[PDB]
Amino acid sequence: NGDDSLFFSNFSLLGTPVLKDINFKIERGQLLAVAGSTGAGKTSLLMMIMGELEPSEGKIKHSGRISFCPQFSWIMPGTIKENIIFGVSYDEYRYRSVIKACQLEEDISKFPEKDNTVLGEGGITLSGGQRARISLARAVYKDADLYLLDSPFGYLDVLTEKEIFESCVCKLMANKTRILVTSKMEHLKKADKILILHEGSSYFYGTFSELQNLQ
Amino acid sequence: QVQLQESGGGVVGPGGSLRLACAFSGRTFSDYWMAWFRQTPGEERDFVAAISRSGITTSYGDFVEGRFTITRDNAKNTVNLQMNFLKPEDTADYYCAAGTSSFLRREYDYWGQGTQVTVSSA
Numbered sequence: 001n002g003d004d005s006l007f008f009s010n011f012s013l014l015g016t017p018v019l020k021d022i023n024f025k026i027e028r029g030q031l032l033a034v035a036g037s038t039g040a041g042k043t044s045l046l047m048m049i050m051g052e053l054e055p056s057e058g059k060i061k062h063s064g065r066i067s068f069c070p071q072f073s074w075i076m077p078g079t080i081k082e083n084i085i086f087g088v089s090y091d092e093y094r095y096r097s098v099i100k101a102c103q104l105e106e107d108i109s110k111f112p113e114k115d116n117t118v119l120g121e122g123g124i125t126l127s128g129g130q131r132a133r134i135s136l137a138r139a140v141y142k143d144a145d146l147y148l149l150d151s152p153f154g155y156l157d158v159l160t161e162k163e164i165f166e167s168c169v170c171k172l173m174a175n176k177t178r179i180l181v182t183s184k185m186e187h188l189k190k191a192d193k194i195l196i197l198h199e200g201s202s203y204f205y206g207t208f209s210e211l212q213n214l215q
Numbered sequence: 216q217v218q219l220q221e222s223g224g225g226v227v228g229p230g231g232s233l234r235l236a237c238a239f240s241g242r243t244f245s246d247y248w249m250a251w252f253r254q255t256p257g258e259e260r261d262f263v264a265a266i267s268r269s270g271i272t273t274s275y276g277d278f279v280e281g282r283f284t285i286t287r288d289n290a291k292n293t294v295n296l297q298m299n300f301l302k303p304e305d306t307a308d309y310y311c312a313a314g315t316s317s318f319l320r321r322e323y324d325y326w327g328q329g330t331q332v333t334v335s336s337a
Contacts, residue, residue, distance in 0.1 A: 005275075
């Protein structure tokens with residue numbers, strides 16, 4: 001079903017050049033905000049986390065339990081809907097809510113064939129933020145036990161960046177387990193636990209209150 | 216084709232310490248995650264501890280509250296469970312399981328024979 005806590009104790013054992021001395025907890029339905037300098041090792045950590053909780057070698061895999069959202073918005077050949085679903089069964093109410101929360105409702109409607117507008121090597125090209133919104137919608141649509149969101153906001157104005165964090169990350173995914181690599185202090189205020197990395201090591205693990213008490 | 220064999224079981228006093236140890240054999244230990252369970256006769260099966268393929272990720276039963284620690288030696292092919300502050304109610308047969316599934320939704324594919332631990336107040 002689910003272990004209410006996962007204790008990671010990587011004291012420079014895995015990915016030694018980038019990651020060194022990271023120790024933290026992840027509990028069900030909590031928003032963990034990974035933050036830190038540029039060379040901290042945020043993406044490396046999400047990748048590390050993933051390679052621990054993943055099925056091993058050649059296993060049937062069936063339903064996958066981790067849902068990853070990379071920085072590099074990916075677009076496979078196929079319709080806007082196919083890209084979001086990504087193999088997973090369609091559900092109109094699950095899909096339409098994910099679209100509205102990821103703020104793609106207006107964008108999809110103006111396009112010619114709407115959800116069936118084909119993307120990739122044979123079809124339409126997309127906006128920088130529009131690719132990032134599809135990449136995020138695809139990740140939040142997948143029902144997974146854990147969500148790794150490496151800088152899901154990019155090429156988005158602070159008006160939509162703070163609206164998608166509020167509607168999608170905090171209102172829609174309120175009960176899912178999130179690990180969100182973020183920068184803005186507003187994201188850190190709404191977080192359940194804050195992990196601050198520095199040059200590959202964990203320097204702070206706690207709440208926004210403890211963080212401001214320490215500084 | 217794997218086979219497991221636990222050891223370290225015995226009878227310590229109330230508020231004691233004991234170190235259980237399983238033996239993975241027959242395949243690459245590194246590919247499997249481990250787990251510890253217990254069976255207090257008459258009561259339900261209880262999840263005790265679980266450890267990832269590398270050993271960087273662990274998770275414990277709600278009843279451990281900090282007392283037990285799960286470790287592994289991928290070179291010597293063993294998973295160890297260090298139990299401290301054992302209260303009499305922790306008396307049970309401790310089984311060790313190994314799987315090669317997702318760590319979030321675990322499927323305990325293989326099991327051990329169980330080693331008896333007893334916390335005698337006397």
